[PDB]
Write a protein that binds this ligand. Structure first.
Ligand code: ADP
Ligand code: ADP
Ligand code: MG
Ligand code: MG
Lengths: 567, 110, 225, 228
């Protein structure tokens, strides 16, 4: 016939197959490649199916052509139903044919129910078979999409999220329940999602008072110095400043502390610390001051008077914290006065509300969208770790507190939230440096605990080898577009469960747009082709050649200098 | 009379001084070869079935058991409250109008 | 025939080529190098383009010369248009000849549009093959030129910037819109760009008040005490 | 020696003509501005590099404020060339180079969207910090000869070539290895020979040493030192 192949030797998880005739040559081109499917039986009703790991076509002078195929049994097909598992044994010899379209269809359409299938790709070797994943297990367990630049990582990320949005239950019209947050550094998802809410530096206002205790001392204190007097004066200023701006029930006011999410004004906090750099005790060891209303003694009731600048110290000796906080103050106003941090430490953070920050972060405000794109292109890199950690922790503890409401009502956590981390190695590196510590811990709690609270990850990173092992291993679903760095491939090989022969040489040689889906979301790790984005991502990069190719511009330079002076 | 049960996730990050003191060892499915190699080293070739372990299966080793063997732990008739969130099925419904009042009250409380 | 090479073994990403007859020696020196490109086909229409990775030539007293070439199928060509491919199968035996100039050119030229092509170098094993880069994408993403002293990285920097300066949209006469700043420390780029603006210590006027607080501390204070 | 940064000229110069000097938008336009920083003392060299690198970056940062307000098609892209980038941006976190490190790393991380891009030209790549070297996408790897620089580059290269370990010390003169977004495959290239080559005025020590013992030149060095 066209193909005459049979199994010559078996192993616990390996079939070695000898192709004997190969009359029809296009059988070898598309049906005998690495990752293709073979039907291994002597009948046409019960069979094993096998992925192709390796092949070798030896040809020599006089003897026959030695086409040897190394295959691994992926499961068992009985009467059109596919059953996963390599436990079933084929006693050699067994006649080997390429699997028909219905068998490859039954591989992916049997392990997943008709309502749990999430299709966003088709098989690369056979276009006519779609490859669904268990969309519950696809999204509940965290997703890692890796690959080099130009391999199609952002197109794969975008195409997953559009299929998450466009899929709906029947009987209703309008926006669905899916909530996806994207950390966009290269500003690519505006062109992918036109009907979505995007928040850049000029638009998004992140309140600084929503930063927790760990995030506040990273942004303001020095971890390396570790000064407990500077630490104590920071907490006792912010805790007191949250008390004086609370307008509510006194019982809630007592439980307000340094980590509690309440509004405080950072300018008065600097003034309190700057005043406490100039304390002067009397002979009774009490600090005495004088504002416009008269002299007073520094105690619990009158410590709020130090928030104003117009206080003069009145005493004989040096105070308790006199001269111990000057390097604290100068760095404290260095970050407040900086114009790059107006979105976080500016005047706009005074007029926003804890509700308004949540309503803007997951697009629950006046305009509602499934996709919230956080354009952090303009965010300076020293606060990129702070801002990502603030938003990630604001979604995790929302995901925690959403569940604990529903546990009281004996219900499930209603809304599940996905966060997409583009270029995730910058937030969460393998390096244990303190400058990316707060974003590392924020992604850690989502990776290790967020599965039970409705907060998950989409780690989309160009360099997986610059992501930490303790967060990369939590991503059960793994997508491999095209990986070319040897350290990058040796990294993912060390973090991958099994899948021998589908990564060893396949990842460098993959085409653009085709990937490798694996995990418990899929029946077997297969090379699939991610379907094309009709509304693709498009970062508006500066096309350096065409702008250099044209005339030397002269009108623009005068406008740049005077705008710099105006701002 | 005070012993410990170390219900960790990955052995590669737990302190050596506690994890070496443990003698009875139960290993479920372990997808990280670094985690596999630590479990392999404790044995004096059944570790190669650690990643292909089915759900609920375990490998018990130590002086409590006669031989290190792959076992199926008994199903919990009264299971602990660990419910997996169906991401697809929740996302299929309407945009549920959830009021933020009650959630941020307790977030501000604790 | 000049050279009679033939594929004898096929792997998923590896090709073994046996050179049976080598009448022209010059094909071996230039066209059968370590990084040279081979076309693998039984016809002149559709070919499998493969780069070489290793070779071995064996001579023994009685037997014939065993010239073996180990190649890797980097791509595929169809009617002069190159497709970068993965595990496209060539059933052995297949006649192997050195790749044509138009085939090697189509590997580098077809991936970049003609407007975005930026050429500053040619292929090392084929000087007739110009190697363009996506000059749209070459500059906006950062460049890192690394080598040893005396490897020529000052020449490579100079040649790239000369190619970025003389190029224009052709609709005008005068200076283009390139803006390149060189932190020249070895006093060497004065010769490469004679019509440029050079600023040494005697001509530069850097205001001290534009320094930030961190820079101003190092200019004046001592940090050891 | 610090007259260029602390002289009477630095007080009278205004903010606008500083950028006309660094970008060459002054009286005489130029595409290429060469900053001869050889006579700059090494104690302040990181200060002057960071001052200029910051000044170009906020020129590009405030470039985009007009283009979002006016929506004009025109733009000024700027490339910065850092010859010997390993001393301006070292791996060490010592206080002496963290000003020039922070200025370069701001350009390497945010400068893509503002039109301020950078070219790193270093003979010792292993001293450049990984948080700056990995931000580059196109890598022109010439003959790399030290094993520490070979191992550093091979990790942070976006791709690989066949037998790259012996390829790097065996590259001939002008031979390079370009990988990244701009090129299609990693190819071994021959860079075009410079018709007008970059030449540095170097002191031929052996050539002047074989000459006669000079006598007149010693007194003219002292009198200018005495008068200035
Ligand atoms: N499924 C696909 N089919 C065909 N081409 C694709 C597909 N996905 C991406 N591409 C192409 O790959 C290129 C790289 O895009 P992308 O993968 O988003 O880059 P990155 O990997 O840097 O995110 C795009 O220009 C796009 O045209
Ligand atoms: N592409 C090339 N082709 C031929 N010769 C070159 C090439 N590039 C550099 N050279 C020569 O090699 C020498 C090395 O100088 P260069 O590479 O510029 O120094 P460095 O690498 O130390 O910056 C130069 O004198 C130049 O004449
Ligand atoms: Mg991308
Ligand atoms: Mg040089």
């Amino acid at each position: 016939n066209d193909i005459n192949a049979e199994v010559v030797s078996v192993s616990p998880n390996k079939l070695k197959i000898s192709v004997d005739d190969l009359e029809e040559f296009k059988i070898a081109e598309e049906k005998l490649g690495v990752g293709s499917y073979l039907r291994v039986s002597d009948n046409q009703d019960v069979a094993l199916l096998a992925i192709i790991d390796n092949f070798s076509i030896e040809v020599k002078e006089s003897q026959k052509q030695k086409y040897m195929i190394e295959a691994s049994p992926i499961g068992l097909v009985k009467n059109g139903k596919f059953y996963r598992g390599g436990d079933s044994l084929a006693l050699p010899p067994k006649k080997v044919e390429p699997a028909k379209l219905d068998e490859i269809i039954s591989i992916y359409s049997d392990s997943i129910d008709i309502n749990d299938r999430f299709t966003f790709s088709s098989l690369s070797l056979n276009t006519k078979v779609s490859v669904p994943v268990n969309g519950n297990r696809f999204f509940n367990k965290h997703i890692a999409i890796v690959g080099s630049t130009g391999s199609g990582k952002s197109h794969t990320v975008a195409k997953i999220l559009q299929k998450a949005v466009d899929e709906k239950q029947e009987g209703y019209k309008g926006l669905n329940n899916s909530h996806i947050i994207i950390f966009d550094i290269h500003s690519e998802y505006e062109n992918a999602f036109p009907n979505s809410n995007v928040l850049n530096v000029d638009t998004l206002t992140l309140p600084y008072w929503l930063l927790n205790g760990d995030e506040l001392e990273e942004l303001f204190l020095d971890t390396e110095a570790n000064d407990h007097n500077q630490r104590n004066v920071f907490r006792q200023a912010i805790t007191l400043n949250k008390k004086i701006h609370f307008q509510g029930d006194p019982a809630t006011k007592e439980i307000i502390s340094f980590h509690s999410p309440y509004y405080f004004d950072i300018n008065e906090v600097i003034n309190y610390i700057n005043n406490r750099n100039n304390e002067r005790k009397n002979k009774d060891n009490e600090h005495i001051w004088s504002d416009e209303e008269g002299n007073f003694k520094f105690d619990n009731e009158n410590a709020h008077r130090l928030f104003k600048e117009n206080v003069t110290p009145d005493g004989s000796s040096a105070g308790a914290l006199n001269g111990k906080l000057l390097n604290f103050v100068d760095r404290l106003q260095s970050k407040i006065f900086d114009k790059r941090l107006d979105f976080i430490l500016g005047e706009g953070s005074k007029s926003v509300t804890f509700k308004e920050t949540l309503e803007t972060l997951i697009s629950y405000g006046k305009d509602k969208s499934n996709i919230t794109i956080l354009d952090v292109s303009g965010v300076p890199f020293e606060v990129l770790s702070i801002c990502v950690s603030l938003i990630s922790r604001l979604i995790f503890e929302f995901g925690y507190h959403s569940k604990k409401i529903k546990r009281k009502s004996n219900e499930n956590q209603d809304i599940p939230i996905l966060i997409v981390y583009e270029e995730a190695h910058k937030y969460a590196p393998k390096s244990d440096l303190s400058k990316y510590r707060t974003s590392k811990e924020a992604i850690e709690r989502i990776a290790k605990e967020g599965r039970k609270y409705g907060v998950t990850l989409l780690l989309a990173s160009q360099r997986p080898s610059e992501i930490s092992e303790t967060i990369f291993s939590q991503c059960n679903t793994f997508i491999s577009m095209r990986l070319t760095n040897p350290d990058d491939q040796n990294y993912v090989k060390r973090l991958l469960p099994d899948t021998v022969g589908d990564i060893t040489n396949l990842l460098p040689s993959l085409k653009e747009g085709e990937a490798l889906i694996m995990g418990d979301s899929i029946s077997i790790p297969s090379i699939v082709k991610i379907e094309k984005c009709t509304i693709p991502p498009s970062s508006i990069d500066i096309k350096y050649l065409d702008e250099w190719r044209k005339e030397w511009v002269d009108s623009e330079f005068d406008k740049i200098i005077e705008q710099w002076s105006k701002s």
